[PDB]
Symmetry: C3
Subunit: 363 residues, 3 copies
């Protein structure tokens, strides 16, 4: 296997785009939603935890998530990237690029949780939680879905992380919750998340091919459809649209299309977008932790719908040989259930260890 | 024809850069120019109309603009991208990428109009206007210039949209007009527009070749020359430069070089930049709708100057075989005249239909 | 030599990313640090001087920095890019792209100086200073390090500009100094600088190869390590972290890894990051001109450490044949000393000429 320079270029740019989603995307998003007096502290926690994730990833994260091991975890043969030749190739790109791309996904997942909870959690407690949750929840789930683990071995479909990122973070944030003064800033963060999401979704193809092109177009379509779906629901239920509704709709479509983008047709993207936008509005209506309502509900919806719209007859790329829509749907549901329980349990353990060691609630 | 992965990568990144120009570029630009009390509403209208354009584009826009038809419109053979194989190639990239790239241009064109008029127009009225104007003005003009229609068939030169985007939007906005509290925000929007404009201009080559490189360098040069031209005029006429003047100068150069970037030499880019910056200052001095003065005047200037500076003797790539500078200038003037009348008439019809159905002026 | 389209694509995107560091990165960074009443003026000076640098670069800058000449300067054979065929290749990319990429480095270097001093300097005086300093300091130092001049001919290692950019600007700013109201804005500028820095560092490979991948990963690692190093020092010395500390730490790591990114291993990047973060904190503690403390101290630290960590035995790419670590360290020290003296003297001359002609201090 030789590296393709076009894929190397595409993937390094896509990685920078995903990093852009956390720094400063998610920080600005939450920054405009939380109380003004808590903004500085939250920005500090998001930046420091981002740094922490980057370091844990290179030290042992990548190795445990992507090394060969068992159904749940990799190995410790790639500690500090030891044994990875600089010219080593993963797919059609240099492995070092795969390390950075995969690391960027861990970063946004953690940013999603930290940005919302920073307001109520002690600084030392969040650092402890991140270490526990990244190591025991993000890493094994990434291994199970993208590292040849349990879910992948059963043929679960999740192109860019409906489970690994969205559902995983939503449950962790919701467990935390249980235990806007600047809308232009919310809009700015939403816009940065949107632009960076093209690297997130299209880069998930691992090459600048027709699947990356499909994921790109589906991202544009689902996001637009979800903005319109949310806004229509808002107009129907509240009498008028709002800026927060439009931004929430964009995020709902981005989240919903995440697991499906590289497997569905544009018709499927439009349908998923509208359904996600409406489900997202329903989610928040029920339930800054409300954000987890969108990531959680839309992630679930997206993961289920991937099991329908991947079908050739519906314009998708087609299910694997010998797999019926019925069989695929069951696999999607099982993957969702496993992600929820795994993340929830680990998050509980993380919060408890922090509370027992330094105390959870901000002093 | 086979897709080149390097071109696929370049074009997907360029598309994200153009999308970045609208979300959040143009929104922040207008956001700092309009009254504070109208900012939220404008951001909502820009986001919702952006979503609408994305959907109309995939449903029928792309097909009618880029399908084979007549001198004015394409066809309905590509509705919802039907009949476009995922592996289909357009130029040296997958057609799906061409769909997204072309769609991003429709988005910024509409954002230019909506951002300025949002303050004075009813929400439902702007949605009606967008549908009418995108369908009857943007689509046919795009077809005429870039889709093998009337203007292209007469050899009109417009590399990145001096007519299709700038003049087209300026006239529509000016028809609307007829019927700064945050300068750091204006600066931020200008900066995002500038960075995204490299995807807009260089991506217009459709490949990462020497023409993309030329357009890139010419973009840097014309923008810089226009900032200096505007600022000098401002210093001479008002006694000092201002932040708004510097930002306006950047936009004047970006607009002026848009139709010429892939056809002229760096000397030509410098001259076009200075002339555009000064013409832009003159334009605003005469005439947030003042913004259309820059897009309109600089677009016209840029389109005319392309007919001069494309000449080999002036460092350009050269006019087509058998075409004199005199003949090319006439074609540029005719293209400008047609764009102005076409856009103006359609815009009038759009505003009138909205006013007759829901009422134009914000209630 | 033929151009590789993958490298052309990568390098044009990397150039836009470096331009993004100045417009609006550095402007927002300083914008949140300086007094509110001076923000507009500073943004104007950064924009106008950016334009000036772009023009001087194309007119004669590129030719004098990268043309063949002597140990200190190039030639005037490439004035306005004359004699450079559009299809001319430099390395594996079109020369026009090399012109734009190199120009973007000149821009950020000047932005670093102008953003800090704008508050205290007369507008006309800064323009005079920029012309003198860019021409007599940036150009010759760029030629000496990257244009086959004195330092390169002695085998100095500086992958992305620890000397040419960081030390060069820090000394110029400090000579100037001798002669935060919005922390969310500082954070936003820091984030943009960070994202753009991937184009700055990885693009310095000139191709989307394994060295670009290495520089990319090392950038992620050193930045994260420096954020943690600074924050730990801050917690130890002040009792708690702060947002400004976290942002300063990121910049310290970015600066420190700049000369080393394409030559060291990830272990080396982590060590350089931590040392840079701590040295940066020490620097500011001693000494908006405090920013030069970070760029100056971290640039020196990074340049020295490159001479250690490039060693094969420490995970680096290895020193050139026949070069010991001892010999390389001496070359790094000599390069640093020469950069400091050269920049300091030229800066003094620049400020003096401005003061004698129009007066330095803002009227």
């Amino acid at each position: 296997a030789v590296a393709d320079k076009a894929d190397n270029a595409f993937m390094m740019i896509c990685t920078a785009l995903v990093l852009f989603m956390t720094i400063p995307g998610i920080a600005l998003f939450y920054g405009g939603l939380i109380r003004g007096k808590n903004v500085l502290s939250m920005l500090t926690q998001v930046t420091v935890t981002f740094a922490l994730v980057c370091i844990l990833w290179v030290v042992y994260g990548y190795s445990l998530a992507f090394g060969e091991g068992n159904n749940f975890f990799g190995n410790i043969n790639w500690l500090m990237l030891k044994n990875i030749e600089l010219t080593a190739v993963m797919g059609s790109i240099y492995q070092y690029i795969h390390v950075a791309f995969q690391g960027s996904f861990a970063c946004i997942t953690v940013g999603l949780i930290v940005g919302a909870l920073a307001e109520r959690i002690r600084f030392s407690a969040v650092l402890i939680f991140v270490v526990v949750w990244l190591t025991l929840s993000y890493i094994p789930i990434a291994h199970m879905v993208w590292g040849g683990g349990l879910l992948a071995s059963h043929g679960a479909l999740d192109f860019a992380g409906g489970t690994v990122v969205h559902i995983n973070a939503a449950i962790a944030g919701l467990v935390g919750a249980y235990l806007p003064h600047n809308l232009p800033m919310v809009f700015t963060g939403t816009a940065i998340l949107y632009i960076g999401w093209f690297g997130f979704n299209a880069g998930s193809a691992g090459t600048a091919n027709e699947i990356a092109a499909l994921a790109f177009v589906n991202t544009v379509v689902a996001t637009a459809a979800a903005i319109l779906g949310w806004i229509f629901g808002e107009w129907a239920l509240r009498g008028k649209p709002s800026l927060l509704g439009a931004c929430s709709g964009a995020i709902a479509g981005l989240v919903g299309v995440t697991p499906a983008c590289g497997y569905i047709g544009v018709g499927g993207a439009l349908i998923i977008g509208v359904v996600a936008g409406l489900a997202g509005l329903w989610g928040v209506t029920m339930l800054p932790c409300d954000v987890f309502g969108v990531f959680g509900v839309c992630g679930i919806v997206g993961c289920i719908m991937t099991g329908i719209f991947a079908a050739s007859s519906l314009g998708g790329v087609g299910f694997a040989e010998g797999v019926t829509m019925g069989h695929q749907l069951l696999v999607q549901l099982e993957s969702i259930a496993i992600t929820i329980v795994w993340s929830g349990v680990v998050a509980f353990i993380g919060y408890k260890l922090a509370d027992l060691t330094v105390g959870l609630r901000v002093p």
